[PDB]
């Protein structure tokens, strides 16, 4: 009766959520996060410093859109993140409220864009090991996960490791080939245009 | 009001071009009076106060009491019929509504700006009125920089040059997301 680990696919757009050993991602919510910020002017020497318990007085998810007194502030921007405190707040909120998983007795796998710099991964892993005290961690590119999921298209029993994946994203779509399990490192290119700027152009023309 | 009084003198101005002409006339030949009654009495002896201005057509207009009459409307809004108080009274009320301790600091520092406060002697009249209204036990100082016309622009430039303000701006990602109700929340 070993406990299942936890599966999370963070990103700029709708963040997928759910548990392992299951055939449907139970929770699919945006990255929108609320905060009790307002209009101070001293905002570059005390970003927030919320007095008392007001620091955690913020919602998350689809319920966070319909709160018209705070600020909807997306933490992610095509992989790279400016301030990761909002990311930590979102992670704690999800793990506790939605997943309800104790980090000390669970394994977390995280996904990041291939262009993510080493510093961000190092510091997020440090944050996890320090605060959540997760026994185990693992981060890998999302291309191989897509290749594994592609087997369901037809003839799952027929092993087919070779191929290539061009994945989409809210702010990034990448190209990654697979050669019998081993990918090519130098044959990877990052595309900045994605499914968000398209909507920007749509609205700009429509206005 | 200056147009209305210039009518009482004998000179008529209605259209907008003469509005600009009267604006220039006020900008060039207007000043405030320390004492209204004394100035009126000296005007009764009108032999040293009248001044002449040259119109574009060449006509010459002589202006007497109107030089120190229109500015007094600021201290006497009843002239135009407005049921309000003068700038001195409003500033006194505003300072009184503040906390007692900060009243001393507010009295010690009184910055003024704008294009309507360049009339010579305005600072002296304001100081006299405030000291008369305020208790006569402290010191009231009026600061009148000679470049108050562009003070707002200079302050805006300095604020923009500030390093800390480089992040307080409002970007377009912001607006891509919601009707500009965002101007208020923030950016204020
Ligand atoms: N059926 C669809 N038609 C058009 N665009 C879609 C559709 N489904 C998703 N999208 C777009 O793809 C984006 C989400 O792709 P996704 O990769 O899941 O975001 P992320 O990079 O965080 O994983 C959305 O911004 C959305 O605009
Ligand atoms: Mg993605």
Interacting residues of B3 by C-beta distance below 8 A, sequence separation 6+: B13, B14, B18, B19, B22
Q: In this structure, are residues B168 and A43 in contact, taking their beta carbons and an 8 Å threshold? A: yes
Taking the CA of residue A167 as reference, the ligand 1 atom at the shortest distance is 17
The tokens for A178 are 């697979």
Query: Comparing C-alpha atoms, which of A119, A67, A86, A96 is closest to residue A10?
Result: A86
CA distance A154 to A172: 28
| Alpha-carbon distances, residue B41 vs A115, B3, B35 (angstroms) | 85, 23, 10
The four Cα atoms B181, B186, B187, B188 give a dihedral, to 10 degrees, of 100
For B183, the closest chain A residue by CA position comes to A39
> Given ligand 1 and candidates A25, A81, A170, A192, which is best to mutate, with the most ligand atoms within 8 Å of its CB?
A170
A43 and B167 Cβ atoms separated by less than 8 Å: yes
Ligand closest to the CA atom of residue A174: 2
Structural method: cryo-EM
B74 C-beta neighbours (distance < 10 Å), count: 18
> Distance between terminal CA atoms of chain A?
57
The dihedrals phi and psi of A205, each to the nearest 5 degrees, come to -65, -40
User: What whole-number distance in Å separates Cα of residue B79 and Cα of residue A46?
Assistant: 51
**A83/chain B closest Cα distance in angstroms:** 13
Selected from 3.30.70.1880, 3.90.640.10, 3.30.565.10, 3.40.50.720, the CATH number assigned to the domain covering B1-87 reads 3.90.640.10
* Separation of alpha carbons B142 and A56, rounded Å: 48
CA distances in angstroms from B162 to A47, B147, B168, B171, listed in the order given:
17, 22, 11, 18
The resolution, in angstroms to one decimal, equals 3.9
Partner-chain contact A44 B187, CB within 8 Å: no
| Cβ <8 Å between A38 and B185 | yes
Locate the chain B residue with the closest alpha carbon to A203: B176
CA of A39 vs chain B CAs: smallest distance (Å): 4
């Amino acid at each position: 009766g070993r406990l299942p680990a936890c599966v999370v696919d963070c990103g700029t757009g709708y963040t997928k959520l759910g548990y392992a050993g299951n055939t449907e991602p139970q929770f699919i919510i945006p990255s929108c996060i609320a905060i009790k910020e307002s209009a101070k002017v001293g905002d570059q020497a005390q970003r927030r410093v919320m007095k008392g318990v007001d620091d955690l007085d913020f919602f998350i998810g689809d319920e966070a859109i319909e709160k018209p007194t705070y600020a909807t502030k997306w933490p992610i921007r095509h992989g790279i993140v400016e301030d990761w405190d909002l990311m930590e707040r979102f992670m704690e909120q999800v793990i506790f409220k939605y997943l309800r998983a104790e980090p000390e007795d669970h394994y977390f796998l995280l996904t990041e864009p291939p262009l993510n710099t080493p510093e961000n991964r190092e510091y997020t892993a440090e944050i996890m090991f320090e605060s959540f005290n997760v026994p185990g961690l693992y981060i890998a590119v999302q291309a191989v996960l897509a290749l594994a999921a592609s087997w369901t298209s037809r003839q799952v029993g027929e092993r087919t490791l070779t191929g290539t994946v061009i994945d989409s994203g809210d702010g990034v779509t990448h190209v990654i080939p697979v050669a019998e399990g081993y990918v090519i490192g130098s044959c990877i290119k990052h595309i900045p245009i994605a499914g968000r700027d398209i909507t920007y152009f749509i609205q700009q023309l429509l206005r | 009001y200056l147009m209305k009084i210039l009518t009482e003198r004998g000179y008529s101005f209605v259209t907008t071009a003469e509005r600009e002409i009267v604006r220039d006339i006020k900008e060039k030949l207007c000043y405030v009076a320390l004492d209204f009654e004394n100035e009126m009495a000296t005007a009764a002896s009108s032999s040293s106060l009248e001044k002449s201005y040259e119109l574009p057509d060449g006509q010459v207009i002589t202006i007497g009491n109107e030089r120190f009459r229109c500015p007094e409307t600021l201290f006497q809004p009843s002239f135009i019929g407005m049921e309000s108080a003068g700038i001195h009274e409003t500033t006194y009320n505003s300072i009184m509504k503040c906390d007692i301790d900060i009243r001393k600091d507010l009295y010690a520092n009184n910055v003024m700006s704008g294009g309507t406060t360049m009339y010579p002697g305005i600072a002296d009249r304001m100081q006299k009125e405030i000291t008369a209204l305020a208790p006569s036990t402290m010191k009231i100082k009026i600061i009148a920089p000679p470049e108050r016309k562009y003070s707002v622009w200079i302050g805006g430039s300095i604020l923009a040059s500030l390093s800390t303000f480089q992040q307080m701006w409002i970007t377009k990602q912001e607006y891509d997301e919601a009707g500009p109700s965002i101007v208020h929340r923030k950016c204020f």
